[PDB]
Structure 1
Amino acid sequence: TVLLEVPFSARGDRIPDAVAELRTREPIRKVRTITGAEAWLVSSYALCTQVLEDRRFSMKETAAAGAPRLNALTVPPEVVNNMGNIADAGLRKAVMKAITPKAPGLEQFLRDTANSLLDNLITEGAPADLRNDFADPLATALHCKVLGIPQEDGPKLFRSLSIAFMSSADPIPAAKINWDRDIEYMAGILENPNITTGLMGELSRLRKDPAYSHVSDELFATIGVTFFGAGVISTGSFLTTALISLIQRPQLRNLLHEKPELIPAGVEELLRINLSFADGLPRLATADIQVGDVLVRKGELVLVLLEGANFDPEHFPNPGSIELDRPNPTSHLAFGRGQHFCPGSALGRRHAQIGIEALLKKMPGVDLAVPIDQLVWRTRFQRRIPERLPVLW
């Protein structure tokens, strides 16, 4: 027998029985990644939070030359430190303000786009693909709006993502090609006088502001590419697997349809049980640090298994069930924790809440149109998603 390998399963509709067993017996244990490197897999809520809240477990240094790797880089090394670069350039507050869902028109844009997507589906008739023809276009449309770039440009940028967020043992030639092309697109956007709204609009004017004159010009285009990619792949994938969890629970579906004011509470539970992250979050130990029964050594790789924490019965009793009245409802790790907590968390919540609200209104009888085992789960990818999500209503 060989050392236990990660990831365990590409299926995003059920957590393996093995996670519970692992968490109970060995909440931190050694595993092998797809590159052949060894790593510590952390799977209890307590130890996951300890790692995420201790900056000596570094995200930046996972990109160091010769480090044990979860997967191959699909960005330049320094872009792993993207938020650190943004903060050092003085751009953190501006980036945050631009990607809030409280921007005027934004919530109405989401509703209009979702409703328009659903009407098209209805007109075509069942079956409909809720991933390719609903959740992902909605994510793509949203991030075009958030960035301030043409809606028409969305599908072209989206096409990079099935490779850009691969979880590969080896570097990917196509990833570099798409990167260079997408970076050039965003640089053009910065020079485009028509682009005055959203994130790219704000970055364009900060670029001409004397207070930012010494900010690297390549960081501006990089922010656009990375926030579009991360936002679209994360919201599209989350909404998709959230719709599966909802569909699998007709009474919850009915309840939220009847009482839509419960939808935010519903989405928060759907976030907690969400299996969209295919791998643990990687960190490199920059010191010798005790984690449970293991002294992690400087230079070693640690993987924070989000569903390990989020299904931990010591923190979330009956973790497999959706409870709209938990006393600790946002304390899940779906958005991470600590220094690198997701900057798009508000946008991600609203994308899901509005998508679900529109869906339940337009398709109250929504149900899977194929047996659940017929869903095709994407492999070697940083997210777990079904290639198609056929439904009827």
Structure 2
Amino acid sequence: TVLLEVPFSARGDRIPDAVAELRTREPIRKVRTITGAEAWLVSSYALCTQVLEDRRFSMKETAAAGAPRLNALTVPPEVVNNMGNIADAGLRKAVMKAITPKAPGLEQFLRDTANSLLDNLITEGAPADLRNDFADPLATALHCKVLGIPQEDGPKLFRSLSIAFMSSADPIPAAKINWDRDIEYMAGILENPNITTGLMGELSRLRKDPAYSHVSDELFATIGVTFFGAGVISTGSFLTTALISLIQRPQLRNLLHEKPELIPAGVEELLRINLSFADGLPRLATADIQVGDVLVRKGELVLVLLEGANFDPEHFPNPGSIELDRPNPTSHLAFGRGQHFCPGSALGRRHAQIGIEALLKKMPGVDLAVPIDQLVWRTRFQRRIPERLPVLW
């Protein structure tokens, strides 16, 4: 037999039995990625946290020429160090502040947009596609608002994402075409006097501030493209798969409909059980480091399997059950951990909370319109998502 291949399954509605078997018997295990490279797959909560909390397991170094790769780059190699570049430019605080969900009127905008999307689906009649006509447009509209760019520019930027977030063995020519075009768009935004709000409005001001005069225009444009793309793909994909998990749990759906104050705790559990990340998080060892029974050597690739940690019964007893009263509810790894913890975690929570609150009010009887096995799971992609999510109500 050949070496165990990753990823195990593109399905986002069930965890393969193999994960629990590996976690119990071999919580760090050698695997082969789609490029042919070997890697260490880490699948227990304890070892996943160890890797993510030790910066000697480096994100930046995964982009080095000649390294064992999980997948091909879809961005320039320096962009793998995006957050380090933002920090070096003195822009970290400003970027973080721009992407919080607490800007005046943002939550009301999210609620209004979700309600409008849902009203259009109700008018059109069942079946409705909750990914393409709800979750993704809601994510796109949210990120246009947060960036300060026109809502009407959302769809074309969104169209890049089915390629930008591919998990491919080989470089993708279309990724460069779209990247270069989206960079040109964001560079134009920085020069557009109408853009005075949100992240791009703030970056546009800082760009002309003497304390930032040697920050490159390339970096300012890259922040726009990367935060739009990572935010939209991550929130749209998470909400989509969370809606599946909610629909498949009518008792919980009814509880959250009846007691909406429990939605934040429900979203935290939906984050914990979420299978949206299709691959382990990659890191390259910069030293020889003991992880469990394995001495990982300098230059080797490690893959941190988020659902390995998040379904680990030693940390989350009865891991497959959504329980709203856990004592460690935010200790999951859905947003990562350590140096590269998601900078948009609060916005991602609020997007899902508001989307779910709106859906349960407008469509309390929501259910799948097709048997669950009929969902078509996107392959060779950095997220697990159904191509369509047909529902009735």
TM-score, structure 2 length as denominator? 1.00
Distance 1:374 1:268 in 2: 27
Q: CA deviation at 1:226?
A: 0.2
- 3-state DSSP class of the match of 1:233? helix
Deviations 1:89-112 (A, max 9, x none): 000000000000000010000000
Distance 1:290 1:202 in 2: 44
Distance 2:288 2:106 in 1: 46
Q: Percent identity?
A: 100
Q: CA deviation at 1:155?
A: 0.1
Q: CA deviation at 1:318?
A: 0.3
Deviations 1:223-261 (A, max 9, x none): 000000000000000000000000000010000000000
Deviations 1:278-335 (A, max 9, x none): 0000000000000000000000000000000000000000000000000000000000
Deviations 1:25-56 (A, max 9, x none): 00001000000000000000000000000000
Distance 1:208 1:254 in 2: 52
- 3-state DSSP class of the match of 1:377? coil
2:109: which partner in 1? Answer: 109
Q: CA deviation at 1:24?
A: 0.2
Distance 1:253 1:367 in 2: 10
- 3-state DSSP class of the match of 1:290? strand
| Structure 2 spans left out of the alignment, 5+ residues | none
- 3-state DSSP class of the match of 1:237? helix
Distance 1:357 1:16 in 2: 30
Distance 2:253 2:271 in 1: 16
The 4+ residue runs of structure 1 with deviation greater than 6 A are none
Deviations 1:103-160 (A, max 9, x none): 0010000000000000000000000000000000000000000000000000000000
Q: CA deviation at 1:388?
A: 0.1
Q: CA deviation at 1:375?
A: 0.2
- 3-state DSSP class of the match of 1:352? helix
Distance 2:105 2:184 in 1: 29
Distance 2:217 2:92 in 1: 16
| Structure 1 spans left out of the alignment, 5+ residues | none
Q: What RMSD in Å do the two structures reach over aligned CA positions?
A: 0.2
Distance 2:328 2:107 in 1: 27
- 3-state DSSP class of the match of 1:31? strand
Distance 2:149 2:258 in 1: 37
2:277: which partner in 1? Answer: 277
- 3-state DSSP class of the match of 2:67? coil
Deviations 1:160-215 (A, max 9, x none): 00000000000000000000000000000000000000000000000000000011
Deviations 1:331-360 (A, max 9, x none): 000000000000000000000000000000
Q: CA deviation at 1:19?
A: 0.3
Q: CA deviation at 1:58?
A: 0.1
Distance 2:172 2:201 in 1: 31
TM-score, structure 1 length as denominator? 1.00
1:89: which partner in 2? Answer: 89
Aligned residue pairs, count: 393
Distance 2:252 2:174 in 1: 42
1:289-308 matches, cutoff 5 A? 289-308=289-308
1:312: which partner in 2? Answer: 312
Distance 1:262 1:92 in 2: 32
1:19-38 matches, cutoff 5 A? 19-38=19-38
Q: CA deviation at 1:216?
A: 1.2
Distance 1:320 1:12 in 2: 13
- 3-state DSSP class of the match of 1:328? coil
Distance 1:181 1:322 in 2: 42
Q: CA deviation at 1:219?
A: 0.1
Distance 1:104 1:198 in 2: 11
Q: CA deviation at 1:6?
A: 0.1
Q: CA deviation at 1:80?
A: 0.1
Q: CA deviation at 1:217?
A: 1.3
Distance 1:129 1:214 in 2: 46
- 3-state DSSP class of the match of 2:316? coil
